[PDB]
Amino acid sequence: ELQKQITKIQNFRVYYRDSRDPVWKGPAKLLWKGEGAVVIQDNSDIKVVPRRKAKIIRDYG
Amino acid sequence: ELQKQITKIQNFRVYYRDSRDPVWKGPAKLLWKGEGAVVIQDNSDIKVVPRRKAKIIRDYG
Amino acid sequence: FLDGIDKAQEEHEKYHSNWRAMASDFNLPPVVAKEIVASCDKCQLKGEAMHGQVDCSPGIWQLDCTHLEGKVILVAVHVASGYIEAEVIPAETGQETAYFLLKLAGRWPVKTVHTDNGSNFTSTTVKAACWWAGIKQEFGIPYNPQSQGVIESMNKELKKIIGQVRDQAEHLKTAVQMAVFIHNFKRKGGIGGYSAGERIVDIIATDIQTKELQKQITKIQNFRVYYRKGPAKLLWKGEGAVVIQDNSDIKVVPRRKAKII
Amino acid sequence: DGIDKAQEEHEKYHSNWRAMASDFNLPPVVAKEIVASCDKCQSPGIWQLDCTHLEGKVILVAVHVASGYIEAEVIPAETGQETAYFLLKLAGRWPVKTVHTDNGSNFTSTTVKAACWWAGIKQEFGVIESMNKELKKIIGQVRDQAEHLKTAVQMAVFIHNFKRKGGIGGYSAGERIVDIIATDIQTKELQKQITKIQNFRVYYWKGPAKLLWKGEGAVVIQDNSDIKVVPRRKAKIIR
Amino acid sequence: FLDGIDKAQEEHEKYHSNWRAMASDFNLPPVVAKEIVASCDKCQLKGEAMHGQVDCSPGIWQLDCTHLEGKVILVAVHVASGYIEAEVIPAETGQETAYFLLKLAGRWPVKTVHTDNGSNFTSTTVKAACWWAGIKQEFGIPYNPQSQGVIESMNKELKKIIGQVRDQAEHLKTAVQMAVFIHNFKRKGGIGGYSAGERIVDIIATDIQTKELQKQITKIQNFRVYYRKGPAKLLWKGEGAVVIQDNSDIKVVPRRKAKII
Amino acid sequence: DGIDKAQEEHEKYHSNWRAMASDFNLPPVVAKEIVASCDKCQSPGIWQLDCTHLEGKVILVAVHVASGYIEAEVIPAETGQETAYFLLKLAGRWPVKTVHTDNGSNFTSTTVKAACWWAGIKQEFGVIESMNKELKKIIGQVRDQAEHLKTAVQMAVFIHNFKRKGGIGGYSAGERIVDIIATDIQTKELQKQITKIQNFRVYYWKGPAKLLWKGEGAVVIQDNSDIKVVPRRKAKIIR
Amino acid sequence: NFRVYYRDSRDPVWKGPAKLLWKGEGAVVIQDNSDIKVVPRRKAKII
Amino acid sequence: NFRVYYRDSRDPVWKGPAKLLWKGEGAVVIQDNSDIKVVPRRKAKII
DNA sequence: ACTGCTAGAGATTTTCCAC
DNA sequence: GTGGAAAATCTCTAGCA
DNA sequence: ACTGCTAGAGATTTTCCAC
DNA sequence: GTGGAAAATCTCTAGCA
Ligand SMILES: C[C@@H]1CCO[C@H]2Cn3cc(C(=O)NCc4ccc(F)cc4F)c(=O)c(O)c3C(=O)N12
Ligand SMILES: C[C@@H]1CCO[C@H]2Cn3cc(C(=O)NCc4ccc(F)cc4F)c(=O)c(O)c3C(=O)N12
Ligand SMILES: [Mg+2]
Ligand SMILES: [Mg+2]
Ligand SMILES: [Mg+2]
Ligand SMILES: [Mg+2]
Ligand SMILES: [Zn+2]
Ligand SMILES: [Zn+2]
Structure with a gap:
């Protein structure tokens, strides 16, 4: 039900x-x-x- | 004698x-x-x- | 130190001393010295020491024109993935850029294009092409290449790859296509250890899947x-x-x- | 822990490894091995190239048969060099591994052979004909909106790839090709993992x-x- | 993965893939992929991301020639203190630089001069002037302005100050001297909160005093x-x-x- | 803690504040106040300018009277503008507060007055003559080594400032001026501290x-x- | 209210x-x- | 022994x-x- | 009302594998 | 619990012109 | 065997002053 | 021991052309 979709997301x-930090x-x-x-x-x-x-x-690792 | 000069120095x-750090x-x-x-x-x-x-x-502060 | 304020104001009108000098040589508090400096129009000569951050939404492409061996290379980059497309165009014209943009929009879901103010990008032909394909046009602040940093960087990268494969082709167009191939499917690294093509496919597929799933969740x-x-x-x-x-x-x-x- | 339920489900229904991995929270390698353990359980990079004619101009069309995604370009002439350039452009944009051609002189040129060799593409000599018919229909529809034929062709490609939907799921060719290539990437990552282990x-003992x-x-x-x-x-x- | 080594070598000879791509697409260990990349002469296109450190001894001066309003300004900076001397010279000649250097050596204890490879600095006249005054000459690596960073920076600063006082003079020489005055005795900051003149006096006096005291200590x-x-x-x-x-x-x-x- | 010993030492010997601060490890402000507390105990920025003549050329000479440090320059002519430019150069290099001049026409020009006003220098109208004689002697000694007179003058200035030693301590003019200016900086920092407190x-209470x-x-x-x-x-x- | 001092288009003058x-x-x-x-x-x- | 690859004098080619x-x-x-x-x-x- | 970034070369911190 | 080693993360720079 | 740096604009961490 | 505030330290960028 809803839970499978929530877990998938x-x-x-x-x-x-962040708004000032340039590093990801x-x-x-x-x-x-x-x-x-x-x-x-x-x-x-x-x-x-x-x-x-x-x-x-969705990293395919 | 010698201690006054050592203290002055x-x-x-x-x-x-340091050899890689650019900040003083x-x-x-x-x-x-x-x-x-x-x-x-x-x-x-x-x-x-x-x-x-x-x-x-010799910082004159 | 109230008389020091006037003395320092005259001293600054003459020499334009910074707040440290006025504070030291007139016993001013740092706030008053900084106010004296900040009241001088001639001492406002430095901007904020920071950098902005460009848009990295899944549907934004950054385009630019670089030059190589007397030829014009029009380069587009998908900001979110680093996926590039490059074409040697006969001249920096609005017609060529509009054709390139229609091709690009026919292959991938281009929602907005970010570009410098070059004449080709600002032509009414590119405007019509974007209007037909439903693409939103963003222009960076004039003479601010950092706004297009991503694509600018890719220019460098693209040329580098050409320098490695120019000896394998008779013409620059073939070398450009070889470089695009190498960048998209033979250079791995980044957020997911991906190639550019793998990363763009992942980005687009994730966008579609998350939209679908979230729609269902909100429905339920x-x-x-x-x-x-x-x-x-x-x-x-x-x-x-x-x-x-x-x-x-x-x-x-x-x-x-x-x-x- | 949940391997036995997955194995029993496979025996009952012969399900694939994606379904078992999703349902029973197993690492995909385990599900793949479960599928391969049964004796009765035993394309994404394939493109079809053709060159049509319209208003006395040559239109080179490449179709991703697995998805219907189209790439069309108006070329000056049916020349081997130009087909090679188009193929190199295509290979640099999508993961092309095989190409089917109609034994035409341009498709069999040494230049095209060299381009395919460099791009790592294998060459083999009615999806394409139907897709050409659809593309020509769309070009006729939009020709009133373009002064030249190349612009009309690109508009037709855009409309076909993204503004046309159909099939079981009501998807467009762009979504289908992105999904197919993503599934191929997942398969290759899984194959790399299996090779590693x-x-x-x-x-x-x-x-x-x-x-x-x-x-x-x-x-x-x-x-x-x-x-x-x-x-x-x-x-x-x-080891 | 031994056959993978040959497959990846051919793949790299064609496309010049980085070690990540080869490792991922051929199951190579990272060491072997990096070795394959490092054996390709065409893939050696980047140096180490580090900066050196210039000499900052008390006796080293950095000299340069900058240009402003069609005039030539010869600028010298004391590296240890930031103290500058600038003169508008009629032309970028060896004679003018030798005269400037003799003047400078007659005022302050110049032991080393570090300069770019400009024609005036490399002239036999400057060599003779340095030999007479007992100054050793250091030349930076050609076309490496970073080696002279200090003086280069000062150029910027100097010009900045001129921009603030150019309206107070009818000639560029007077404005240059005003800028030198302002930099030396009206801008405070740095290691000791000093100005450049105070800092150079402190540096030289400390050198002399420490030499004298250390001589006494060693003798005792x-x-x-x-x-x-x-x-x-x-x-x-x-x-x-x-x-x-x-x-x-x-x-x-x-x-x-x-x-x- | 050591204030009483310093006070007694000052009473017996009337020593200066530098000596007391060094000997009794007091902050300089305390020693200065100790000196100023007694009644019985109640130059670095002063330069002398002159214009000599040699081989029919004008040599402008500035002498730091407190140290004997010399700055000489061959100028085109005894003009107010040249003197003002020389003064501005001198003020930008060393902390000049006062200048003594011989009432010459160039030294009393409005241009020199404006230069001194901008540089914050006060103008007042036998060290200089003796120094000029010494400089001329050195110029004569080194004239064989220079084709022009300006180069010879600069060589003489260098020799006088750094290659000549004498006096009580056997120091050069450069060392003496550096020491004097350092002492002046110390005095001004101490005065700033006293003004602050x-x-x-x-x-x-x-x-x-x-x-x-x-x-x-x-x-x-x-x-x-x-x-x-x-x-x-x-x-x-x-406060 | 604020005061902004800027350098806009390839013009070094602020x-x-x-x-x-x-x-x-x-x-x-x-x-x-x-x-x-x-x-x-x-x-x-x-x- | 080492191998050095360098860019010497305002020449972008390594x-x-x-x-x-x-x-x-x-x-x-x-x-x-x-x-x-x-x-x-x-x-x-x-x- | 718009906006530096990318990829490679070392260096440093983390984790993994046997003892 | 712990050295070596390999892997992951961090730091930093040139070129885009 | 020679070598990026300087100074200003914000931001963040530290210390000081009274309660 | 602790908020506010002022001061010290840290981070970062343009221009040198
Ligand atoms: C005539 C068009 C329209 C008006 O602007 C000019 C000039 N321009 C200049 C650079 C440039 O300065 N690149 C170097 C660079 C410097 C810093 C940075 F962050 C990124 C960078 F790329 C470009 O890249 C560029 O494309 C243009 C350009 O296209 N135009
Ligand atoms: C003809 C002489 C001799 C041969 O070299 C040239 C060219 N040059 C170029 C710069 C220069 O590129 N400055 C910008 C810059 C860039 C980076 C950096 F770290 C420092 C910087 F100053 C100079 O400053 C400079 O003095 C010279 C020069 O004098 N010459
Ligand atoms: Mg551009
Ligand atoms: Mg550009
Ligand atoms: Mg230079
Ligand atoms: Mg320079
Ligand atoms: Zn000002
Ligand atoms: Zn290579």
Whole structure:
């Protein structure tokens, strides 16, 4: 049911940057993807990254 | 006798850089000055800095 | 030190001393010296020491024109993946760029193109081509190549590869295509240890799949969450936190002080 | 842990490894080995090239038969060099491994052979004809919107690839080709993993067992068509 | 993977793939892929990402020629302190530079001059002037401005200051002298919060005083220290450590395992 | 802590503040106040300019009277503009505060007045003559080594400043001027410190006492010509 | 209100003061005598 | 023994291999076909 | 109301494998 | 629990012209 | 065998002053 | 022992052309 889809979305990985740091942050875990923002979880921390600062991939590793 | 001169020499301050770090290290304490190397004490640590990497000033502060 | 203020103001009008010099030579507090410096129009000669960040959405391509051996190479790069396409065009004209853009939009889902203010990119032909294909046009601040950094970087990379394979082709067009092939499918590294082609396929497929899954979830999962406000749509929950959106303002609140109906 | 349920499900229904891995949370190598353990369980990079004519101009068309994705270009003349250039452009954009051609003089030129050799493409001498008919129909539809034929052809390619939908899932050719290439990438990563682990022998003394998965605190192995799990401490792995 | 080595070698000879691509597409260990890449002459196109450090001894000056409003400005900087002297010279000639160098050596203790390979600096006239004044000449690696970074930086700074005071003079020479004055005695900062003139005076005075004091100490204090070696002349002791100089190799040893006679 | 010994030493010998600070390890402000507390105890930026003539050429000479450091330059003519340019060069190189001139027409020009006003120099209208004679002697000695007179003048300046030693300590003019300017910098830093602390009033209640030193864990103050030390906790400092 | 001093288009001379209309990450939109400009923050100073 | 590939004088083309004669901090002295060159380490690669 | 980045060469920190 | 070694992560620079 | 650096604009960490 | 605030230290970039 809904849980399988939530877990599937959760399986994707997100690389993101903060508003001043130019280095790309590690492979966070996607939780929500929206039209303008993506809600991710990086090291037990939830963040709301603008869509323009996110690269979302299901790494085929 | 000799101790007054040693203390006078020790009053001088030395700014130095390491062989790869481009940032100048803080005001170390001079211990010996030679033709080619300067022996300094920076945070209870004795170092032998090449003369070309040292700025020795008696800060008039 | 009030008289020091006037003395330092005259001293600065003459010599334009920095705040340290005025503070030391007039016993001014650092705030007053900095104010004296900041009131001088002639001493405002340095900008902020930072760099911005370009857009890296899945649908943004950065285009540029580079030159090599007297030829013009039009290069497009997918910002999110590093995937490049390059064509040797006869001249930097609006017609050639519009043709290149229509080709590019026919192969991959181009939503916006970011370019410098070169005459070819600003021509009405490229505007018409983008309008027909539904592409949004972004222009960087004039004479600010950093705004196009990505594509600029790729120029370098592209030329490098050409330098390694120019001896394997009789013409520059073939060498350019060889370089594009090598960059897209023979250079691995980056976010996922990927090639550029693998990375772009992953990016596009992930976009499609996440859109589909999120559409289904929002269709199925329906809740309203109150915290601390109005009818804030529920977005996600778990690990002792609830992420919600209220008036289109996404926020994260602790599981406590939050009720879901 | 959940290997036995997956094996029983495979025996009942003969399901593929993607389904088993998704359902039973197994590493894909284990599911692939489960599928390969049954004796009764035993394209993405293939392109078809043709050159049509329209308004006395030559249109070279490449079709991804697995998806219907189209790449069309108006070329000056049916020349070997130009076909080679088009093929090199195509190979630099998509992972082309095989190309089918109609034995035409341009397609059999030494230049095209050299281009395919450099790009690592194998050459073999009615999807293409139907796709050409559809492309010509779209070109006729949009010809009022373009002064030249090359622009009309590119507009037709765009419309066909992205603004036309159909099939079982109502997808466009672009989505289908992206999905097919993604599946191919997954398959090749899995094959690389299998090749990486196929040169290990594990003793758990029990006979020399093949290695299927080395986890954080477990070692999943196969012996005589029986899949087992053993502790990392109890297992010894060699080349 | 032994056959993979040959397959990857052919693949690299064709496409020049990086070690990641070869390792991924041929199951090669990273060492072998890196070896394959490192054996290709065409793939050696990048140097190490590091910067050297220029000499900063008290007696080294860096000289350069900059241009402004069609005029030639010869600028010298004391590397240790940032103290500058600039003169507008009629032309980039050897005679003018030799005159400037003799003037500079007559005011301050110039022991070394470090310069680019410009024609004026490499002229026999400057060589004769340096020989007479006992100055050693150092030339940076050709077309490597970073070797003269300090003076290059000062050029920037100097011009900046001129931009702030050019309206206060009817000639560029006067503006240059105003800029030199402002830099030397109206801009404070750096290691000691000093200005350039104060810093150079401090550097030179400290050099003289430390030389004198160390001469006295050495004439007075005589000891020989054995550690672990030979008769290593004692240099300093205290805080549980002894600094010694054995065979002109200064070293620091713990107070233990060291005996002084 | 060592203030009383320093005060007694000053009473017996009337020593300066540098000596007391060095000997008794006091902060310089305390020693300066000790010196200023007694009644019985109550130049580095002064230059002399002249224009000599040699071989029908004008040589402008500046002498640091406190040290004998020389700066000479052959100028085209005794003009106000040339003198102003020389003065600006000199002021940009050394901390010039006052200049003594011989009432010559060039030295009294409005251009020189403007240059001195911009550089913050005060103008006043036998060290210079003796130094000119010495410079002419050195120029005569070295004239065989220079084709032109300007080069000979610069060589003479170099020899006089650095290759001639004498006096009580056997020092050169360069060393002497560097030492004098360093002492001037020390004096100005001390004056800045005194100015900074002179606008505090400290209560330790005991009357309003001036502040002399605010140490890490002590406050040294003066009251009615008696220097005392208090802990920071007992002392209250206000502007 | 703010004062912006900027260097806009391959012109080493700095200009200003100008009124700050909008501040973003990496660029600022300013008004300089009825003229609107967009300047990267590297080339602008705001007081 | 080492192989040095270098870019010497405002010439974007890299050269090499060459024999490393001396390695210092920030520069290396190399020999390339009876020709001695001094190259900053930013413009040299040593294997 | 827009925005530096990419990939390679060392160096340093992490993890893995047997003892 | 721990050395060696291999792998992963971090730091830094040139060129884009 | 020789070698990037300087100074200013923000930002972040430290120390000091009274409570 | 602790907030505010001021001061010190750290990070980073343009221009030298
Ligand atoms: C005539 C068009 C329109 C108006 O602007 C000019 C000049 N220009 C200049 C550079 C350039 O300066 N590249 C070097 C560079 C420097 C810094 C950086 F971050 C990135 C970089 F690429 C370009 O790349 C470029 O494409 C152009 C260009 O196209 N035009
Ligand atoms: C004809 C002489 C002799 C042969 O070399 C040329 C060319 N050159 C070029 C620059 C230069 O590129 N400056 C910009 C720059 C770039 C990077 C950096 F780190 C420092 C910098 F200053 C100079 O400054 C310079 O003085 C010269 C020069 O004098 N010459
Ligand atoms: Mg461009
Ligand atoms: Mg460009
Ligand atoms: Mg130069
Ligand atoms: Mg220069
Ligand atoms: Zn100012
Ligand atoms: Zn290669």
